[PDB]
Amino acid sequence: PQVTLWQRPLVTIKIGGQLKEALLDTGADDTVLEEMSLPGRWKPKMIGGIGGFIKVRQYDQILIEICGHKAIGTVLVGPTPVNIIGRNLLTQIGATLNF
Amino acid sequence: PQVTLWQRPLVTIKIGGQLKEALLDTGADDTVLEEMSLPGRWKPKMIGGIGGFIKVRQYDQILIEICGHKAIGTVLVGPTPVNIIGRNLLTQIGATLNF
Ligand SMILES: O=C(Nc1nccs1)c1cccc(CN2C(=O)N(CC3CC3)[C@H](Cc3ccccc3)[C@H](O)[C@@H](O)[C@H]2Cc2ccccc2)c1
Question: Which residue numbers delimit the Peptidase A2 domain (chains A, B)?
Fold first, then answer.
């Protein structure tokens, strides 16, 4: 069900039993969520954007339920200001940009 | 056209005589471009991203041909690693995000 970009395209995730809103972010390669715990273990990666570089912890094989679509992928948790869903998951729910 | 996000949603833009390519980014609110000689007056501004903030020159009333369509808007020109088309413009072309 489609979304116009007049608002920030936020939807709700369920990750790891928790419910958060998240930004659908077609310009991000990866998904980076704020700090919260997630079962499993991780290694560091380092990501950047405008502003520079944060250090995040990466977990693979994480289920996320977006709306009521389930996806499995990497998530990176770290000090992002905003929870972001990026192309790696965006591709799994089949999200297109139409114009 | 439709973009699938399996690759970067990169698009061709002409701004102010100059051809560049830029990322269609639904996460971003405003459009921010690498340093470019656009005609003249600006306000000084800062934007927030991941990593920190950057400091940009806010030019308004910039006309851009985006893909092959056009819009007038504010662009922020400053030291971004990648050029971002953001929703302030994406709405003017009527880009929808879609699942
Ligand atoms: O308007 C903006 N800000 C304002 N502040 C005050 C008033 S308006 C704004 C404009 C352009 C970029 C950004 C920051 N931004 C980003 O840095 N990223 C890194 C990706 C890894 C997460 C991607 C773009 C990108 C991609 C590759 C390389 C560099 C940048 C992502 O796609 C993009 O949406 C956002 C993610 C984001 C959005 C909003 C808040 C925080 C973060 C913000």
Answer: 20-89
A25 carries an active-site annotation: yes
Nearest-Cα distance to chain A for B44, in Å, is: 17
Alpha carbon distances (Å) from B62 to B25, B67, B81: 18, 16, 21
Among B68, B66, B88, residue whose Cα is nearest residue B76: B88
Are B88 and B31 within 8 A, CB to CB? yes
CA of A65 from ligand 1 middle (Å) equals 23
By the 8 A CB rule, do B5 and A26 touch? Answer: yes
Report in angstroms the alpha-carbon separations of A20 from A1, A15, A40, B40: 19, 8, 19, 43
Resolution in units of Å: 1.8
Find where tokens 């729910």 sit.
A93
How was this entry determined? Answer: X-ray
Q: What distance in Å separates the CA atoms of residue A32 and residue A28, rounded to the nearest whole number?
A: 9
Q: Which residues of A touch B24 (CB under 8 A)?
A: 26-27, 97
In angstroms, what is the span from residue B79 Cα to ligand 1's centroid? 13
Shortest CA gap A39–chain B (Å): 25
Chain A residues with CB-CB distance to B73 below 8 A? none
Nearest residue to A35 via CA among A57, A19, A59:
A57
Pairing of strands A3-4, A10-15: unpaired
